[PDB]
Amino acid sequence: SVLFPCKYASSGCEITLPHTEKADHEELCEFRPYSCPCPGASCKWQGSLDAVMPHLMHQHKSITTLQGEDIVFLATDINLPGAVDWVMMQSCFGFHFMLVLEKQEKYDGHQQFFAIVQLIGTRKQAENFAYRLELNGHRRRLTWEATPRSIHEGIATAIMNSDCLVFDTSIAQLFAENGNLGINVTISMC
Ligand SMILES: [Zn+2]
Ligand SMILES: [Zn+2]
Numbered sequence: 091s092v093l094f095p096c097k098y099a100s101s102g103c104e105i106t107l108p109h110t111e112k113a114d115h116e117e118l119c120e121f122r123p124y125s126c127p128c129p130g131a132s133c134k135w136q137g138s139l140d141a142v143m144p145h146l147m148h149q150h151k152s153i154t155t156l157q158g159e160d161i162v163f164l165a166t167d168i169n170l171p172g173a174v175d176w177v178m179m180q181s182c183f184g185f186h187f188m189l190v191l192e193k194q195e196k197y198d199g200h201q202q203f204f205a206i207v208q209l210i211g212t213r214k215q216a217e218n219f220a221y222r223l224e225l226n227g228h229r230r231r232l233t234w235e236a237t238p239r240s241i242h243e244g245i246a247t248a249i250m251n252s253d254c255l256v257f258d259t260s261i262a263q264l265f266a267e268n269g270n271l272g273i274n275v276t277i278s279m280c
Contacts, residue, residue, distance in 0.1 A: 093106040094106060094109055096116060096119055096121070097116050097119075098116075098119055098123075101138075102121050103120075103121040105119070120242075123136040123137060123138065124136065124138065124141075124142055124241055124242060125241075127142065127190075127241040127244070128190075129175040131246075139210075139241075142241065153178055154179070155179040155180070156179065156180045156181065157181070158180075160274070160276045161180055162272050162275070163189055163275055164271075164273075165270065166269065169262070169263075169266070174192070174193050175190060176191040177189065177190045177191070180207075185209060185211055185215070186209075186210040187208065187209055187219075187221065188207065188209075188210065188241070189205070189273075190205070190207075191203055191204070191205045191271075192205075192249060200258060201259055202256060202258045202259075203256070203257050203271075204252075204254050204256055205223050205234070206245045207238045207275065207277070208238050208239045208244070208245055209239070210241055211240060211241070212240055216240040218279060219277060219278065219280065220236065220238075220280050221236065221238045221275065222276040223235070223255040223273060223274070224273065225255075225257070225261075225273060225274075226265065226274060227264055232261065232265070234254065234255035
């Protein structure tokens with residue numbers, strides 16, 4: 091049983107495991123760098139958790155940040171052929187929750203939206219929360235509630251498995267007013 095240091099020991103991590111069992115700790119390890127949480131898979135910054143807020147303050151100034159624990163995100167122009175994602179930050183409970191709406195294109199000539207929120211915080215910190223996403227309309231409500239993913243884990247593997255609010259364009263137009271979609275976001279503790 092010959093032991094190896096974790097890949098991220100050069101960041102402070104002091105664990106040593108057998109060459110096989112690296113996988114587990116190696117991507118649960120808190121010393122793993124955080125990738126830029128923006129749904130834009132085009133900004134490939136990395137760095138430490140404390141640095142994430144700086145990096146968005148600096149390189150993603152166009153992100154609207156919202157009041158408190160129950161807000162309404164107005165995603166504008168969801169039917170624009172060019173529009174592909176909306177993003178914004180919600181400040182409550184002394185944390186920040188990044189809300190991202192990703193438009194993707196599948197079988198139809200149409201698109202599906204995916205909506206999910208992540209916590210600016212650890213995997214452990216994120217389990218103490220839940221979030222709810224509401225699309226509201228005339229005698230209609232589509233709701234999704236789940237546990238926000240930590241930015242450490244990311245949303246890509248959750249988008250992949252539809253583990254978030256999921257809708258296509260005809261659902262959008264049911265709830266879209268003009269070309270804008272109002273998404274009620276509620277964060278809570280648990
Ligand atoms: Zn480690
Ligand atoms: Zn970035």
